[PDB]
Design a protein around this nucleic acid. Structure first.
Ligand SMILES: O=c1cc[nH]c(=O)[nH]1
Length: 223
DNA sequence: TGTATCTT
DNA sequence: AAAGATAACA
């Protein structure tokens, strides 16, 4: 057992020996020697430990991890107990409450329950320097996460990609819009939420598009 | 202070 | 690229 889930390591292995990835890991390690980097080393790839790669039905793509202490744990927008849901997640829960009739605030912020159902909780960038949002962008993470999205685009059919925010939206051109469903809206952060996130209804829409492809819907309350 | 996105 | 401007709030 390790950082990468079995199936994900098998299909993403070709990236490890590539110059951009070797250099990206070197940079992250060098940042960790001078600064505090989120999430810790063992939780950078938690998004690979929740379900098998070919069991992925939905993909929620965010910007980068949370930049405050004990927040980011490798699943986009998630926080493990007893850490309270950060501003972005409180907004996600509010949208979920107006979108899904049965959804109520779960009293915690751990999104592992969605991830176990086949919802890939990925960020365009997988690490961040403490207190500095998007500090690790354009260092190599985008090419790695492009490889993840590309693999899913090529080897699967009828996936629902939820691209939240400008940076997450850059991956739109890596997805075949006729073979997969791409839903795009503003980032749930208070600084952008009013630009389309509130009222986007991505959760009910995902479940409707899944049932049209003959797949089982996501129980958003299973947390 | 702190939690995006468009403009210059 | 990076910083200013804009923008919404317990
Ligand atoms: O994981 C996270 C947290 C905040 N914002 C994101 O885009 N992703």
């Amino acid at each position: 057992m390790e950082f990468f889930g079995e199936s994900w390591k098998k299909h993403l292995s070709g990236e490890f020996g590539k110059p951009y990835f070797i250099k990206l890991m070197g940079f992250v390690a060098e940042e960790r020697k001078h600064y505090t980097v989120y999430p810790p080393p063992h939780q950078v790839f938690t998004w690979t430990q929740m379900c098998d790669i070919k069991d992925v039905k939905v993909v929620i793509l965010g910007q980068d991890p949370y930049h405050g202490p004990n927040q980011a744990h490798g699943l986009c927008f998630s926080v493990q107990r007893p850490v309270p849901p950060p501003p972005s997640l409180e907004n996600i829960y509010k949208e979920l409450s107006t979108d899904i009739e049965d959804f109520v605030h779960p009293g915690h912020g751990d999104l592992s329950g969605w991830a176990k159902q086949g919802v890939l909780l990925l960020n365009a960038v997988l690490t961040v320097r403490a207190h500095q949002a998007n500090s690790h962008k354009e260092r190599g993470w985008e090419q790695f996460t492009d490889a993840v999205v590309s693999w899913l685009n090529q080897n699967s059919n009828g996936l629902v990609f939820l691209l939240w925010g400008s940076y997450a939206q850059k991956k739109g051109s890596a997805i075949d819009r006729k073979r997969h469903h791409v839903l795009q809206t503003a980032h749930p952060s208070p600084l952008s939420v009013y630009r389309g996130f509130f009222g986007c209804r991505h959760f009910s829409k995902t479940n409707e598009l899944l049932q049209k492809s003959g797949k089982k819907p996501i129980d958003w309350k299973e947390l």
